[PDB]
């Protein structure tokens, strides 16, 4: 948990939708965020990549094929911008 953890207001509002998912999926969200907090590279299926265009400076990982986390590491802080479907986030 080397980085500090910060999240947007919108991230909390997104997590109201995430809360409705099965417990397994919620823990997998937490496991991905924990990997990111420790600075660890994600799995190939997470297709982790930097964002282009207006979203430049931020990254996107697939926790599930249709469940995307938008985040960045800035200074010493893992910042969580949004979590949701491709259609909800872009």
């Amino acid at each position: 948990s080397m980085y500090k953890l910060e999240y947007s207001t919108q991230f909390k509002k997104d997590f109201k939708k995430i809360t409705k998912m099965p417990i397994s999926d919620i823990i997998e969200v937490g496991n991905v965020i924990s990997k990111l907090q420790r600075g660890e590279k994600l799995e190939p299926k997470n297709v982790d990549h930097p964002l282009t265009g207006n979203w430049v400076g931020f990254r996107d990982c697939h926790i599930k094929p249709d469940l995307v986390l938008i985040y960045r590491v800035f200074n010493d802080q893992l910042q969580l911008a949004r979590i949701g479907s491709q259609s909800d986030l872009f």
Partner: protein, 86 residues
């Protein structure tokens, strides 16, 4: 007959370039724009590559970038609060 105008503002450089490409193809810019509008109707969509903007994501990113995000003490504490106990 009931005709209306369909119009856009565009930069001068863009206007010139578009006019020149249309000249080489053999049609006017007005005819080209009508062809585009009818094509969009005939396909029920724009038949070539677009851009997507998202205001919600843009505001979230801007809030974080301005240093106004919310701290969490751990992933476990964050999940506990954001799932209201799940």
């Amino acid at each position: 007959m009931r005709t209306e105008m369909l119009s856009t503002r565009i930069d001068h450089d863009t206007k010139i370039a578009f006019t020149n490409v249309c000249d080489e193809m053999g049609l006017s810019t007005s005819q080209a724009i009508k062809l585009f509008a009818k094509a969009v109707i005939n396909h029920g969509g724009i038949p070539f590559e677009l851009r997507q903007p998202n205001e919600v994501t843009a505001s979230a990113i801007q809030e974080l970038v301005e240093g106004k995000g919310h701290k969490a003490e751990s992933v476990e504490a964050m999940l506990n609060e954001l799932t209201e106990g799940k």
